[PDB]
Ligand binder design. Structure first.
Ligand SMILES: NCCC[C@@H](N)C(=O)O
Ligand SMILES: NCCC[C@@H](N)C(=O)O
Ligand SMILES: [Zn+2]
Ligand SMILES: [Zn+2]
Ligand SMILES: [Zn+2]
Ligand SMILES: [Zn+2]
Lengths: 410, 412
């Protein structure tokens, strides 16, 4: 029956958006920047004012706990991320974290007690923008990455994740992944166009498509772009161009349910009149179909070296991100659907297109996701947009799904 | 003639000493224009020149002019010029050989007690390379009236630092009006940066021409979007447009052989996140030909096809020329002088069309100009493994020396 405070939630989103603003009304609040520090501090202060106690793990993940009435009951987590892309929207990650805070504030308002404690979770470096892989803290949590692997990830300026975590003062004391969860929920914008296009308020997320991030390092020969005869050039840029085209072909020949593309690129030494000695870029390929994902990976890894060999270019590939398609916990999926039905919101099943911390939580606990629409499916763009009504409806569903799972006690 | 030759060892030592300033990671140099290492190199060069009796002037572009007087106080100077600034992956010999061969010619004239009618001016042009700040040949460009001082000063590097502020910072903002000097003649000695002299077993390149260039900077506008969740049919992929442009440039280059090059050395994605399609992709296409019609045909074709590639993908396309000169013909009288010097000295020689751009290309606009080349191993340049021998260096310096003496005129 009872709804969260839509205005309080919205105001919190607008306040958090002031921290680490981008250039176009979104956010550039990347993981382990001073702006990330400030956002974490603001979130902490709100949660502490709402009666939550804070724990922080050695990956900087923040766990804000509301007690249950059963002191041995495992917690129901509500998680997402406050770190953003360089061209981040105000809603990616933030909606889920702040909807957790609002769920708690509404429980406080209504004097609600639950059997299971509730833990609002802010995972470090979900985005994998500054340091790859994405979902890095939740990955250490679920036992997929070592702490030392995570700490040694570097940004483009050669700064290491571990040192930056230490720099901004968010190194916590808890062993990563020492917490066991009764259940994990994550509310997130769709980052796709389906809910909007289908006129559905709520995405009942059943699955998440898998990914490989394959980082290519191509070795060319630095040479003068003026005086070097064409047939003596070892052109790693041209090899990269052919690889990008080949990735487009691979993605298109695996439709529907496949994507492939490149967002990050570096030439060295990156002089206008020097052919690059090194060209580094990451191919992002995804599919909800396991066999398709692995076929795309195998094909790209077989074809790309041949492209390079034809040009005399060296080719090295490193996986800097990976998870197989995820199936969310079917019982919690039904809980989400039942919450939508109880509240009178339209819903449909979705397969998440993006990766989320929920994907790793799913390895160690019953996990599901809830989505609201976003305009044009636009995300990782500062123009990312949802309405107050969209935000609120999904937060209501989160609230009720959590209450059903954590169990209201009079 | 017979017997007046430069000191090969002194020249070589000077190259090896200068190579210690702003070393790269593989035995070459990363001594880019208007870095502190450039400052140190300039100061070392200055001190050597001053020890050889040369007097220094510096212009507002930081170009250094080191004068050996002549016997006629109204005679205009014969310049010997090149550049001490390097690429990030620079060789020890590109630019440096020409400047230090100037110093060596002067030291040899001093050793032999030679007097000339015309003064000799060893010239170190600022920012020939156009690595850090584009265009290349920036100071010689201002000198020859191609660029305004304010255009040059406003050039920015990838860190957003401006050329004018950096020039001032390292202390090389001089007082002379740029281009106030008139030259009787200009010579530039440079490594070939191509494989021909070595392959043809020739000691000296009698440079007759320099191939022309366009540097076309593309700015492609895509739409930032999530690389996971965005359907393929909704993507506005500026990276893919760039890939197709690079491929089209390769096709253009290959269909225009022989005597054409096209390629890309510089690229930027924004925001350059692994899971964000780029909102902006910026890169520079370098196309060259010795043939004017071919050069302009390649430019017109690239500028016509690239917007079509982009339009097919919904990508915006903007093109700016950030460097250009038409093929250069060097002064025939000075070419003959160079050839005659090689013949007098008994060096094997052949004619060359320079593949690279040089400060000489702008000097040619305002004075009788030519170039001399020596071989380099495998034609490799803009790579730290750039290599010449002591003997190659010295032979070309001898030719420079004799060409300069003929032009400046020995006075007993
Ligand atoms: N909001 C983030 C979406 C998940 C993402 N880091 C990814 O590349 O899948
Ligand atoms: N330094 C020798 C090469 C000249 C160069 N600025 C070019 O791109 O042509
Ligand atoms: Zn997210
Ligand atoms: Zn995101
Ligand atoms: Zn040069
Ligand atoms: Zn050069």
């Amino acid at each position: 029956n009872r709804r969260v405070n839509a205005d309080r939630l919205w105001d919190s989103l607008m306040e958090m958006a002031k921290i680490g603003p981008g250039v176009a009304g979104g956010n550039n609040r990347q993981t382990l920047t001073d702006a990330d520090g400030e956002g974490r501090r603001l979130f902490q202060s709100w949660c502490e004012e709402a009666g939550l106690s804070m724990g922080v793990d050695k990956m900087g993940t923040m766990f804000l706990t509301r007690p249950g009435t059963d002191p041995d009951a495992l917690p129901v987590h509500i998680g997402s991320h406050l770190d953003t892309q360089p061209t981040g929207g105000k809603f990616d990650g933030v909606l889920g974290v702040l909807s957790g805070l609002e769920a708690v504030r509404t429980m406080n308002d209504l004097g609600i007690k639950t059997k299971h404690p509730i833990v609002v979770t802010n995972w470090t470096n979900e985005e994998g923008a500054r340091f790859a892989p994405a979902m890095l803290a939740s990955g250490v949590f679920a036992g997929v990455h070592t702490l030392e692997y995570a700490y040694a990830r570097k940004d483009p300026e050669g700064k290491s994740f571990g040192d930056e975590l230490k720099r901004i003062g968010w190194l916590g004391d808890e062993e990563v992944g020492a917490r066991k969860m009764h259940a994990y929920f994550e509310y997130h914008i769709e980052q796709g166009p389906i809910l909007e296009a289908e006129n559905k308020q709520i995405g009942v997320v059943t699955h998440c498509q898998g990914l490989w991030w394959l980082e290519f390092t191509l070795t060319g020969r630095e040479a003068h772009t003026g005086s070097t005869p064409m047939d003596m050039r070892v052109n790693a840029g041209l090899a990269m161009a052919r690889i990008l085209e080949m990735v487009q072909t691979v993605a298109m020949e695996n439709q529907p349910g496949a994507v492939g593309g490149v967002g990050q690129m570096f030439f060295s030494p990156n002089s206008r009149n020097v052919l690059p000695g090194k060209v580094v870029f990451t191919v992002d390929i995804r599919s909800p179909d396991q066999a398709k994902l692995d076929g795309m990976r195998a094909r790209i890894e077989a074809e790309a070296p041949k492209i390079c060999e034809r040009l005399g270019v060296g080719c090295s590939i490193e996986a800097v991100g990976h998870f197989d398609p995820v199936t969310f916990d079917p019982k919690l999926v039904e809980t989400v659907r039942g919450a939508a039905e109880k509240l009178g919101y339209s819903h449909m099943n979705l397969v998440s297109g993006a990766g989320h911390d929920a994907c790793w939580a799913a390895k160690v606990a019953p996990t599901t996701m809830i989505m609201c629409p976003c305009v044009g499916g636009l995300s990782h763009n500062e123009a990312e947009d949802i309405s107050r009504e969209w935000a609120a409806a999904g937060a209501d569903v989160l609230f009720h799904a959590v209450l059903e799972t954590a169990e209201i006690v009079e």
